[PDB]
Nucleic acid binder design. Structure first.
Lengths: 122, 88, 132, 50, 155
RNA sequence: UAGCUUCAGCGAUGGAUCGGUUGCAUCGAGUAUCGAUGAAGAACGCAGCUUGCUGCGUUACUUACCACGAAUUGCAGAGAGUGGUGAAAUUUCGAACGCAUAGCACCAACUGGGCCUCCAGUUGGUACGUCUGGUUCAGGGUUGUU
RNA sequence: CUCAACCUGAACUCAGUCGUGAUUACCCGCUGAACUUAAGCAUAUCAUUUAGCGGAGGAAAAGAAACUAAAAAGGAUUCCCU
RNA sequence: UAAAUAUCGACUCGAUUGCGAUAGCGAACAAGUACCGUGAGGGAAAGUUGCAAAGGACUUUGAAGAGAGAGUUCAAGAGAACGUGAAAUCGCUGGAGUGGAACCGGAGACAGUUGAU
RNA sequence: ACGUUUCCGACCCGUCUUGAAACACGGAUUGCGGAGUGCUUGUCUACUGCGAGUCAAAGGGUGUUAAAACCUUGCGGCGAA
RNA sequence: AGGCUCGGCUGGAGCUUCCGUCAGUGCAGAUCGUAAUGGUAGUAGCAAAUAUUCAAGUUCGAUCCUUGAAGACUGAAGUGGAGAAGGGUUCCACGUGAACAGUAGUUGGAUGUGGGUCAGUCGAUCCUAAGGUACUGGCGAACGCCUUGUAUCAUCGGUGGCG
């Protein structure tokens, strides 16, 4: 019946592949039942089997992408699909450190000129 | 003889379906779409065609990516984080 | 009179929200008042009605009848109560929809979540009544 | 024409699928207003300008 | 066809004026927005005056107005030197500096010099680091009286 | 008598009027967020029964996670289902990218055909312009050395 | 004639980047009519405006005087009243 | 090189001396849809049963549409194209007129209507 | 009284026109919709407040039945040559 | 007088006096817009392409559907048998009540439910024709245009040895 991704999170790659194959075989059997005048009770399981396949694929992809992200976390250049998907303009923006960069003249101006805190009596 | 007699000779299409807009306005001999301008890189729109612009403008379709971006902006385009690990 | 600038007193907006509310919001909309005895027993005034509750009809042509609620037809904003039925022409039996606001709860179907909700409501009622 | 293109055939197949009477059980749905498929097409009356 | 004694028409409506129309239905909204902006700025820069920099005293240019005075952009370098304030010190203390204005008359210079002196007298200077006050820095019971000024400084 | 006209009563045809109103118009307020990480738009497809509309993309009227807490509903059917949404996924055309523009072709690996120079499958890749650097170069253009 | 520099110019499926195309309410640069009014009409007007092309942002553009002026002088830009 | 300034095109909100289905956006509804043109493009009509389908079981004539009974319902003369249901137009029953128009104003009569502490 | 019958009178409305019942044009019938408006600028007139003054602009202050109301002008418009 | 009050019937949820003030404020016409409806009127008409008849079947019901017999027609440059463009399921089978088939209908290119198109050899796919469109180059305020040409031009690939 309805699988639990919480349980699936503990299986291995081979086990998940085997379970996916079993679910696909069950779906094929249900399609055969559909075509050969199957009962409504049988036909009602197609949605459950399809969503079970979806859950298995979700777990597989999540595990694979987590592993790849860990592997490439330290590389200077990462695969395009592992980079941050913000807006195009946000990606083209300057980095925080580059924005924080200041020239020698600017640093000297910051040192010398500095606004104070004051109040004016009415 | 213009009219009924001449209408019997109309069996060669001058326009076909366009790859970009799906309209039957692609001129075969000119190799250009009379509606969207394919294969021109840019899109065909004229300010005198206000109703045409309204018909073919953004928002008349699905705007799947635009809606996705609008939804994601509401939380600052946060990535690499998941909801607090909890249960039922 | 409302004071919140972000709450609309527009009849059209209110009606649109009511009639396009999603299921979880219709759950809150379909609330019923507790009887006097149950109100003193549990400390709350009203709760979102639930299946398997026991109610008594307080108004309408079926006033005074009692039974268990079978279904909460949220799509139709009504609840079907046990034994509140009529007969179609052919003879079959059909439950008569009743609006939960016109019944009164006589017994609550309590589980973990419902007990927690009742406790929350009672604590809030105690706090606000003490402040008042 | 007998000698046609696959994409024209695909469009014709979709039109064939679309040209179909409305299911009868849809008329029993809550709030339903449709009483028939109001977009039925007859091959001889209305023509697909492909 | 004008008839009888009339003043000849002059309305400038021969252009497609319907394309360029401006209404003022948002005047109170703009007023509220500017009040809110002033409040936000006051919170941001408290306890400093909301008006901002101190402005100088000026004489209106032409003879039609030269009997009046108004606020200026800032204080000239001559004025700052006469009042004994450096340009940098004025910038950090919150005094507008008009680098373009120059004084050609002792009376005009002296009026603004007196204005600067009075502002310096009324000024309250908080410690740069609260723990360690320095010289020129205002005293603690003076700092306890500090309040935000609203409107023009030294109106 | 009949027919015709007219009056009273009754009934048709027709859909005016009245009664609201999840719609429209205008005013005001808050925010700044499309695209080669593939946009806008288009095409096709996806449901147990579901043409259209709406939703979605081969995990296809949706998966995961989190909040709430018992339904969906036309018939079936069996932590529900709703909301949020940070994880995963997101078909083909389209700036649309191997070349063309509704077709055919090149490179590499791996797998199968028994072997493979021949086939088949899978995967990855081959667009234009431009910046920085790298490698291999061309010119008595200028110069030095043998 | 050998080798080595520079200069200029190439090829690379060389390593890593970037541009293209959309949107129209506002914004920036160009191009640019006629109807109409003149009781006709050509300068004029409509109008440095419909239409056409290109280019951005959340605002854009402008902006710290080769300024205004002629007082006992004002002092970047933008916007409002006059 | 920010601020004051412009702008609802996009997203999200609050209002109104505005319209109330021939009005208001073209579109209150499977509306930029049906449909039309080779194409640029053009472009509608279409809101309302009832509180609740309780949407008329069953008998009867007919091949059927449909009708006669019956039942539901505050009510079905609210019966599905279903709130109300106008005028034009039309059919029936009864009365009265009726020689190439008919209608109409003034004045009586008849029929008729209505009032009488 | 839009019924019938008598006596007298009785040409089809709208429109342009010197002149329409016209052999002048529009009108088969009914429902619903349908046309001197908005704004800027003048002038006269009527009413209201103040009066050699009057109105105050943008703006500012306040106001939460906060787009309102209330307060606020060396200066500006018109008038006083 | 513009109109108004009341009575009776229908109807089922709003309406109203008076005081100020405002207006998308009054229709017989505009060959007015839109929707509906009359007399004409059961009238004009349903007359080109030679032609049908008998018996039976099915059906509630047959000039028109089906079977048999007869009589005619196209007459091989056909009213025959197949294709290209175009159509797009109209193809085939089984039901059919309403609409449509300007009579009818048991029949149908209609309508409801299903079924149906199988390629190494037939075509596309491949070659180029007229011609189109790119690259450079030039022009152009620009979208982009012009040339398909020694204009432009550093545009490569073939045998062999070695490996």
């Amino acid at each position: 019946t309805k699988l639990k991704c919480k349980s699936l999170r503990g299986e291995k790659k081979d086990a998940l592949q085997k379970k996916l194959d079993e679910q696909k075989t069950e779906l094929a059997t249900l399609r055969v039942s559909k075509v050969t005048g199957g009962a409504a009770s049988k036909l009602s399981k197609i949605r459950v089997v399809r969503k079970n396949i979806a859950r298995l694929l979700t777990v597989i992809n999540q595990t694979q992408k987590q592993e790849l992200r860990k592997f490439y976390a330290d590389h200077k250049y990462k695969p395009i699909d592992l980079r941050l998907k913000k807006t195009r303009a946000i990606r083209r923006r300057l980095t925080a450190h580059e924005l924080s960069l200041r020239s020698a003249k600017q640093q000297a101006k910051s040192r010398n000129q500095a606004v104070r805190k004051f109040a004016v009596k009415a | 003889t213009k009219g009924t007699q001449a209408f019997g000779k109309k069996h060669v299409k001058s326009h076909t379906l366009c790859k970009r807009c799906g309209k039957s306005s692609f001129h075969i001999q000119k190799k250009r779409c009379a509606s969207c301008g394919y294969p021109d890189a840019k899109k065909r729109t004229y300010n005198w065609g206000a109703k045409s612009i309204r018909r073919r403008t953004t928002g008349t379709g699905r705007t799947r990516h635009l809606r996705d971006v609008n939804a994601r902006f509401r939380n600052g385009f946060r990535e690499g984080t998941t909801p607090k690990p909890r249960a039922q | 009179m409302k004071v919140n600038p972000f709450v609309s007193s527009d009849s059209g907006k209110s009606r649109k929200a009511h009639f396009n509310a999603p299921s979880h919001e219709r759950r809150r909309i379909m609330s019923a008042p507790l009887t006097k005895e149950l109100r003193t027993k549990h400390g709350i005034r009203a709760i979102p009605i639930r299946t398997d509750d026991e109610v008594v009809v307080m108004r309408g042509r079926h006033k005074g009848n009692t039974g268990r609620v079978l279904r909460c037809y949220r799509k139709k904003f009504v609840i079907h109560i046990d034994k509140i039925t009529r007969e179609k022409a052919n003879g079959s039996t059909v439950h008569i929809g009743i609006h939960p606001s016109k019944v009164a709860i006589t017994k609550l179907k309590l589980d973990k979540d419902r007990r927690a909700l009742v406790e929350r409501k009672a604590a809030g009622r105690s706090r606000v009544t003490g402040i008042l | 024409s007998a000698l046609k293109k696959s994409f024209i055939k695909r469009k014709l197949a979709k039109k064939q699928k679309q040209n179909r009477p409305m299911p009868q059980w849809v008329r029993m749905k809550t709030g339903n207003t449709m009483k028939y498929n109001a977009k039925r097409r007859h091959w001889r009356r209305t023509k697909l300008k492909l | 066809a004008p008839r009888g004694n009339q003043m000849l028409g002059n309305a400038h409506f021969r252009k497609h004026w319907h394309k360029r129309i401006k209404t003022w239905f948002d005047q109170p909204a703009r007023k509220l927005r500017r009040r809110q902006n002033r409040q936000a700025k006051a919170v941001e820069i408290a306890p400093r005056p909301v008006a901002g920099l101190l402005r100088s005293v000026v004489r209106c240019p032409q003879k039609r107005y030269n009997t009046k005075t108004r606020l200026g952009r800032g204080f000239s370098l001559q004025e700052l030197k006469a009042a004994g304030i450096s340009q940098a010190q004025a910038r950090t203390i919150g005094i507008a500096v008009d680098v373009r204005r120059t004084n050609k008359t002792a009376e005009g210079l002296k009026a603004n010099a007196d204005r600067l002196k009075e502002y310096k007298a009324k000024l309250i200077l908080f410690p740069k680091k609260a723990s360690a006050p320095k010289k020129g820095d205002s005293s603690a019971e003076e700092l306890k009286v500090a309040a935000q000024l609203r409107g023009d400084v030294l109106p």
